[model samples]
Target: TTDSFWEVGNYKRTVKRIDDGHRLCNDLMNCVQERAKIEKAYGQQLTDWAKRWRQLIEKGPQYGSLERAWGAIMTEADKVSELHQEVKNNLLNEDLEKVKNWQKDAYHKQIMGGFKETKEAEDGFRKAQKPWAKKMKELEAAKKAYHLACKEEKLAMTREMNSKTEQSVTPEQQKKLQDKVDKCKQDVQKTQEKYEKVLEDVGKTTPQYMENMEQVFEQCQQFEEKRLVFLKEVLLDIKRHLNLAENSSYIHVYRELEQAIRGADAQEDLRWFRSTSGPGMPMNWPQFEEWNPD
Candidate 1:
């Protein structure tokens, strides 16, 4: 039913947002670190794959433009590996590091617990609530005293009524019971006045208490705003580092590989193999040499 943070839970609900901010920073850093690990492992795998394939191809039967085209593929893999390794480096050293540094400074942990900023706000709220709390305690005490006095008055009246009904009750004793009832009535009135006075005091201080609490809550709101803005920039930075479109080297690696594949001439490679491997060698005709041996 309340739109204000201070009004909802006495600033406790509002301050919880700051705690979530700290958790958000940790989550962001962890995400970046995990992604970096993946990139590094993938780069290593690509390098290993390229090395193994290059060794296999060097000793295999492939030759001419086909061999060059196949070699270009391994080179392309190496280039792609390098690019990914660079990405990993940037993510770890630059992106993650920046976030860590910012989080350290902004959400600096106090010696007791909690961030320094949040602790300050909490202290402020506690200080502001102190006077109101004191008044509330006084009011509760006064109300308890008033209710006890009223109960005593009722009991005294009942005892006097029972005395009037009993034959053993003397006139003097009955007079004493009436006096006791009057005393109890006076006590009730006195306690009621005290209770009303305390209630009025609380009412008078409530506006100031609300104002102080709202000021503290506003401070928390400002801190949260700053945290949100910083986190937004951090997310953008991570995106920039991970964007494939921004990585020209990665794109160029693929482009170069495409060109190398297109350069492979299958007909030329077949003709070269036929000429050098005896398939294209001249054959002798034996049609005019039939009677030479006789």
Candidate 2:
């Protein structure tokens, strides 16, 4: 294996951490934004209902008893509805915006900053590995040479001692064959040492590569911690605003008032009033005409 193995492995690790950090950011942003939409929609819903209710109450028929009976409750409803408006305008409005802004300014920026650092680290690693690449290739070449030298040496020895287990040699021929074997052996030894030295140098750079990655992970951890705390605060605000909507009985009371008004006209007697306003009441002033016929 070459430094490309270690170098790319470390770079890949750094990229994975950066990608994980971005995923965390997306999850948090989604959570806060979803809550914001719910809260904002709920606030508007209540505001519209309250405004319409107040108008309906104004158009209702005047009845002293109904007025007295419902005035306090209705007026209190107006006040409560106004408070709902206040909460919407302030709490829901401000909190939702806060979460969005924090996601954009803080958490998002942290993720982006992490990407920048990771890229720089990758570039630094690539530069550092430039020298190792050539050396590693050289080591591979040397290893191939050593293998060839061994094969050559074996062949030279086999020529002297035949495959049939017979020896074909003169004293002079034997010396030359022995010399060729020795030269091949020397070449193998030299290449083996060169290959070993290249491996040692590549090994030495591993600790530095590890150190860079350690720093990358730690920075990511720090960013996540801060972002998580911010998200917690946003969630708390959402709960507080949502509780107001949850515990409210104002709508129940308002609906009761509306039902009462709807049924009210049916209870009042209007027949006598209509007769008095007609073109004429019957000619009998207060009673029937005198019955004079006998």
Candidate 3:
């Protein structure tokens, strides 16, 4: 056995009495390691394993090694449990945020405005073309009805004039009838003007309405692009937080272990954590084999 660690003389005969739980932890390792050492020393003695178990569970009223070792391990286990809970909460918060962002993104992209240009073009239609087109339609209908009424009145007047001519009407009656024809001509000209105005408006309004629909169709591409950029950012933040939540526990556990080992005083007590802080075990190096504790 090497004098530094392997030699039987270098081993601690009892546990340390300092720190909150280090004394108990160190003693347990000592008791277990010593038993193993002795078993090895005596070739093979399996009967003493039960005594090691009894020493572990028996609480020390006087604050001895076994209880201290158990306490230290329990502390470590509690730390790991805390790490687990913290990671869980973080993950939940991250997932919730991501889900909320996704919902917003979907609504913006799908419902509010598909493409800005298209939305704008549609708005143009609503503001100008649609209203003008509706007015033109109303005017056109009114003109058609008026023209129909004039045609009916003119036909009835023509039949009455023909009957009067057949009855050898007086010159006065003929003159009066000729005056009616003149008045009818005036009415026909006015109706024609009104009808022509409505037709012109309809002709102009139809093309403009069609043009607005086309304009709306063209502008919607801009809306799609802008919505896509926004949606991507929302998802990115969610994923970042979720990833942080995923690995935080191991980091938390490592930090706790770092705190505990900073002031520990036993060679073997700190030995188990060498996997954590590296092999040097630089802080406490009692040469148990060379020096006797007073």
Candidate 4:
């Protein structure tokens, strides 16, 4: 009775429309957030997966060593599939360590320049040491003989001088001892130089143990930088989309539409109530006491 009755139906319909629109926008925003989460998880897990898998498959394999460890590799391949299932269900991070260990084990086992290659390089270094080792032993023997000859020559001189007779060391004996000592010295020097070079060669060549560390360092550094850039781009894309949900301009427009329709519906409902007991009915009619919007 306190409101206009002529336009109540129109107001009710307008309010319903506003209610539905507001709810629709709310649900839409909810979906955007949920989908962003799902998509990020999907992209990250699968990209990592494919990168590791490609490394395993595409790199040319050396035929004999880890290539023959295919059974274990295949098991891990199946394990990766199981991880994919968990990723699909959003439980991947919970069991991510399983995947990480498998990757490391696989990389060391069969991947390019991995365990088998390193071991072969080590064998090469060990084999290269054989010649230097022989030279070392020969030098030691020559040195011992030179020392013995020096003592023998000195003894001969002492005995001849003490006898005070024609017992001096012969020139031939002195010359022979000197030559033997000189030869030993030369042998020692030559082998020592060769030993030093082999030490350097081991570090620089096939077993290139020190160089391997350098290679690994650069490889990981480049990969990390590349990963960071792409991941930033992915995050940037998600950020822009999420920002749209909170932007003040969009929020203002949404509020205007919802309020406008809701206000109209409220007015219509009030008018309808009043019109149901309109001007034709007595203000104090008994029906008014019990009547409602049937």
TM-score of each: 0.82, 0.52, 0.33, 0.27
Which structure among the candidates has the greatest lDDT?
Answer: 1
Q: Write the per-residue lDDT of candidate 1 for residues 93-188, one digit (tens) a residue.
A: 998898889887887778877678788877888888877777877887999999999999999999999888898759899999999999999999
Which structure is stronger by lDDT: 2 or 3? Answer: 2
Which digits, one per residue and each the tens of the lDDT, describe model 3 over residues 1-294? 344411222212111111212232234334434443443433222223324434555544423333455445445555454443433343344433444444444333326545333334345445544556466567867687668758855875795568675756577777776776777767677777777777777667666655654454344334444445544663464345335346666577557655655545465544545644677556676755775789
lDDT of 4 by residue, 27-79 (tens): 43444445644655655665566557546754654222233333234334444
Worst 10 residues of 2 by lDDT: 264-273
- Give the per-residue lDDT digits (tens) of candidate 2, residues 55-96: 676677743345434544555555565555545554446665
Better of 1 and 4 by lDDT: 1
Off by over 4 Å in 1: 1-20, 108-115, 245-252, 279-294
Candidate lDDT scores, in order, read: 0.85, 0.60, 0.49, 0.45
Give the best candidate by TM-score: 1
Q: How many clashes show up in model 4?
A: 8
Worst 10 residues of 3 by lDDT: 11-20
Q: What's the CA error at residue 128 for candidate 2, in Å?
A: 5.6
For each candidate in turn, give its C-alpha RMSD to the true structure in angstroms: 5.6, 8.2, 29.2, 31.4
Higher-TM-score candidate of 1 and 4: 1
Better of 3 and 4 by TM-score: 3
